[PDB]
Amino acid sequence: NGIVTGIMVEKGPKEALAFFDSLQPLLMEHLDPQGFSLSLEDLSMSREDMGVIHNLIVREISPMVSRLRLSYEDELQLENSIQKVKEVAANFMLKSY
Amino acid sequence: STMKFCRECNNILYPKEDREQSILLYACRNCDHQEAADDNCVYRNEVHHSPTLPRTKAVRCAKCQHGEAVFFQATARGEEGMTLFFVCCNPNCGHRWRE
Ligand SMILES: [Zn+2]
Numbered sequence: 300n301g302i303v304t305g306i307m308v309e310k311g312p313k314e315a316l317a318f319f320d321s322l323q324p325l326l327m328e329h330l331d332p333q334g335f336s337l338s339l340e341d342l343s344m345s346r347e348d349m350g351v352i353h354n355l356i357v358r359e360i361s362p363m364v365s366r367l368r369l370s371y372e373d374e375l376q377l378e379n380s381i382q383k384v385k386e387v388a389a390n391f392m393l394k395s396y
Numbered sequence: 397s398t399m400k401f402c403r404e405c406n407n408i409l410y411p412k413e414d415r416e417q418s419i420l421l422y423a424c425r426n427c428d429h430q431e432a433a434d435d436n437c438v439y440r441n442e443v444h445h446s447p448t449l450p451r452t453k454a455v456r457c458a459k460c461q462h463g464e465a466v467f468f469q470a471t472a473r474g475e476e477g478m479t480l481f482f483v484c485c486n487p488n489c490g491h492r493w494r495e
């Protein structure tokens with residue numbers, strides 16, 4: 300997006316459209332003899348890591364919902380702890396191609 | 397206030413006081429029957445009603461390794477005026493310490 304803006308600055312819009320119209324089939328033909336697909340092993344998280352993430356619902360979320368019994372308005376603290384869990388959960392499933 | 401009833405008509409009693417002997421007495425309104433009172437209370441109500449305190453989250457506790465300790469104003473027997481104290485909302489804490 301930097302290069303297209305530089306072309307539009309230097310030679311106008313009718314060269315930016317020529318850049319797009321020369322680049323897009325050059326990409327879509329590069330994908331044609333390689334392919335790209337999904338698998339069942341992509342959606343399968345490993346079991347010991349599943350045991351790691353299940354040891355965090357009853358370590359910092361069940362003792363926090365023990366405070367949710369009387370405390371109301373810590374919903375953003377709730378979401379802070381939740382996204383702390385969600386980030387380390389999403390960290391594992393980016394270890395696949 | 398327990399309700400009381402007449403022994404002749406079994407209707408409800410109405411409290412009524414004549415100051416000839418400085419004495420309270422329950423009277424019925426149905427026939428004519430009266431008798432002497434026993435209790436004192438003419439009426440009893442017990443009107444009704446038979447956390448929103450500030451919390452912090454950056455201080456050490458005693459037992460649990462949490463940041464929270466709810467602070468409210470107190471004036472204890474060994475304290476003086478305005479004093480603050482820190483007990484964590486976790487029931488593992490159970491301990492009240494001074495600054
Ligand atoms: Zn009567």
Ligand SMILES: [Zn+2]
Nearest residue numbers: 457458459489
């Ligand atoms: Zn403690």
